[PDB]
Amino acid sequence: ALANSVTPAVSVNNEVRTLDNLNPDVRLILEEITRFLNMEKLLPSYRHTITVSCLRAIRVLQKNGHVPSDPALFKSYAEYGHFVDIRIAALEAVVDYTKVDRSYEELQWLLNMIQNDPVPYVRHKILNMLTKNPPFTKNMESPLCNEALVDQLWKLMNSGTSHDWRLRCGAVDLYFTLFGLSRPSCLP
């Protein structure tokens, strides 16, 4: 409910988001989610629901112009040793970031995590979230439509996902969402 109340901020001349331009409404929300996440670090709950809700709310505040658009927090919560609900919430935030900020290195981070993660459910979920919220569609001109990305995703369909039968269908779905049924256009 605190995350639902966040309206987009009135940035002037692309002013860098600092404490000087912090909304007086959003400072209370940010204090509350900081208190909740830190208290979850000492007293946890069930399903780490409050970690998932606070990561989702920090991504809501980053989607508007309130918190700086930095994926390092979600990249630290998406490590292997965390609970799987925290991991998929953080990876959902990283997928949303690499869709909005057109990040090349975050997409390479996600594709590397698809290739070598210990939990195969997390790999399937990353392919699923990158299909649902794709970094670009076939209609879009994006900076991320190289021949290098076409070769990486074709290598991920062909080899690489050969051991799961669910990662390979997810890679086929991702290649269909990104490049369509015909020849990838952004290619010689």
Binding site: R17, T18, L19, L22, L30, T34, R35, N38, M39, K41, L42, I58, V67, P68, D70, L73
Partner: protein
């Protein structure tokens, strides 16, 4: 009365639900703020904004 009259007297009791809710709420908020600032200062810390 002062020559021989004695009655005990007590302190003013605050039985008001409004101020008791306010006291318990503010004490819980202050102790959780003090706890989280102490734990963020004596460990690894993050900061949404720069130098925060």
């Amino acid at each position: 009365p002062h020559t021989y009259i004695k009655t005990p007297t007590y302190r003013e009791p605050v039985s008001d639900y409004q101020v008791l809710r306010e006291k318990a709420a503010s004490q819980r908020r202050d102790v959780e703020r003090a706890l989280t600032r102490f734990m963020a200062k004596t460990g690894e810390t993050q900061s949404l904004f720069k130098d925060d």
